């Protein structure tokens, strides 16, 4: 990635002031609540306060790594199929069980839990106390993307949105149109986001119009993202932002190839 | 001196206020001492100076519960105890070390609201601040706006008093002062301005039209302690402040009071 860009929040741990190495060569970054991950040449690169341990970098992250998530207290790594997790683990969120050792395609962290999509099914792990952590039968199989939230989880299978955990504002009620055609999903706080063919589709709590969704991302939008009370939307190289009052800045107008949403913190790569 | 504190405005276009307090010598250093800044997150060192005053130190072991409902953004440890509940002196310790904006809100809440603050500041003598709203919306900053608005000179006494003064009672004074010390939030900020052998307690803030504020009491090993409030804003709303502006207006202070 050329450049790295990361903007609003109140930046009160250091979270969005990416240090040089991680300016470019970037392939992937991931927001926590205090800290952000940068994944370059298959290292795993780290800024922020670490409090809990999260920015204690297992030796296995140095290297070969091939895909990086970060939850609040917690960070997570995918590497030749095995889900690697490090940083505060007082709800269990950094135990990896077994079954996610080997063969996972993909993974997810939620504020104090982590997911794992091995051969389309959906394994969790860590806080279980809105029922986050507790799988649908129906996320068990035949899921192809996944998203952690704040007590929430989602996943995608058969082009339909399956979610779980709270419901205070109807986060976890999946809408008619989310049910065929999506290609991604992603949890807020109080608001849940699905793709579909590029129109963003968004339910849930709007008090701080967090589905208030821009005319702009209703088409040709290629990734979604969203933080506790914000969303994230990326269209042609633009990215689009709402909710709490977030906006994209000049800098992240055109030639955006990736964008992350921690809790508060944005993060656009740039090609 | 003035020409070093000028001259960072210009080096970081921003507008900056200073007040400064060596309570060793009773002597004061001051830049723009008077004018408006939006206080952001630095009310809840003072607050909780209120809460202390207003309250027994066995009150703080009584439980708050409250639920998703009354969840306001950037509350990374209330949205984890959200309906099992905290105590009251948790709940003041999250907004003082995480700058917890729901724990804010329960704190002005248990203080009688942003006028219940501002009322008990008034009855320390401090006709200046002006404590209006409840988080998040507290941090909008608009220039010319009054509204959740104080001095570096009004702060700094305020904190003094909490902190330094007779406020407090030395044991709540204890509390707080713990309160305030050893948190990440403080780390770029007066803390990273001043030798690394003096003790920093702090309160940071950050809001709006690059609002980024710091206030401490920090100690130099062999000294009574100082006293600093350093706020600062910029033009444009959207405006990204820079850590380093505090950190060497602390500097500026230290070598000041060599």
Redesign the interface.
């Given at each position: 990635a050329t450049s790295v860009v990361a903007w609003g929040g109140n930046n009160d741990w250091g979270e969005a002031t990416v240090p040089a190495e991680a300016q470019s060569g970037v392939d992937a970054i991931a927001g926590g609540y205090f800290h952000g991950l940068a994944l370059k040449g298959g290292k795993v690169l780290g800024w922020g306060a670490n409090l809990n341990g999260q920015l204690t970098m297992p030796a296995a992250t140095q290297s070969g790594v091939d895909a990086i998530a970060a939850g609040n207290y917690h960070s997570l790594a995918l590497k030749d199929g095995e889900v690697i997790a490090w940083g505060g683990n007082e709800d269990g969120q950094t135990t990896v069980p077994a079954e996610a050792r080997s063969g996972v395609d993909a993974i997810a962290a939620g504020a104090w839990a982590s997911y794992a999509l091995k051969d389309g099914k959906v394994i969790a792990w860590g806080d279980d106390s809105d029922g986050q952590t507790t799988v649908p039968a129906e996320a068990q199989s035949g899921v192809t993307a996944l998203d952690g939230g704040v007590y929430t989880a989602l996943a995608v299978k058969n082009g339909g949105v399956i979610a779980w955990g709270d419901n205070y504002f109807g986060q976890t009620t999946v809408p008619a149109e989310a049910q065929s055609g999506v290609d991604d999903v992603a949890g807020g706080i109080f608001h849940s986001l699905a793709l579909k063919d590029g129109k963003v589709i968004a339910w849930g709590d709007n008090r701080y119009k967090q589905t208030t969704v821009p005319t702009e991302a209703l088409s040709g939008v290629s990734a979604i993202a969203s933080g506790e009370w914000y969303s994230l939307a990326l269209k042609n190289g633009k990215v689009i932002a709402w909710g709490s009052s977030r906006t994209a800045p000049s800098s992240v107008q055109s030639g955006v190839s990736s964008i992350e949403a921690g809790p508060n913190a944005a993060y656009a790569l740039k090609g | 001196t003035h020409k070093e504190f000028s001259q960072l405005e210009k080096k970081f276009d921003a507008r900056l206020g200073v007040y400064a307090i060596d309570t060793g010598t009773n002597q004061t250093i001051a830049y723009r001492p008077n004018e408006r800044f939006a206080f952001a997150?630095t009310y809840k060192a003072l607050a909780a100076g209120v809460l202390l005053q207003q309250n027994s130190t066995k009150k703080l072991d009584e439980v708050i519960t409250y639920?998703?409902?009354d969840?306001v953004?950037?509350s990374?440890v209330t949205?984890?105890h959200v309906?099992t509940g905290m105590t009251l002196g948790e709940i003041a310790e999250a907004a003082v070390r995480y700058?917890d904006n729901t724990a804010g809100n329960i704190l002005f809440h248990k203080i009688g609201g942003p006028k219940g603050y501002e009322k008990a500041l008034r009855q320390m003598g401090d006709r200046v601040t002006m404590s209006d709203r409840f988080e998040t919306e507290l941090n909008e900053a608009i220039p010319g706006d009054i509204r959740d608005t104080s001095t570096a000179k009004a702060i700094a006494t305020n904190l003094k008093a909490f902190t330094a003064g007779n406020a407090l009672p030395n044991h709540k004074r204890n509390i707080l002062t713990k309160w305030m010390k050893g948190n990440?939030?403080g780390?770029?900020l007066i803390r990273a301005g001043v030798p690394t052998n003096w003790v920093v307690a702090d309160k940071?803030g950050?809001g709006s039209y690059g609002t980024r504020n710091d206030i401490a009491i920090v100690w130099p090993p062999n000294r009574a302690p100082i006293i600093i409030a350093i706020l600062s804003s910029k033009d444009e709303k959207?405006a990204?402040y820079d850590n380093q502006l505090i950190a060497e207006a602390a500097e500026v202070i230290v070598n000041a009071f060599r």
């Open positions: - | 997150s639920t998703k409902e969840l953004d950037y990374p949205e984890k309906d700058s990440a939030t780390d770029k940071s950050a959207g990204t």
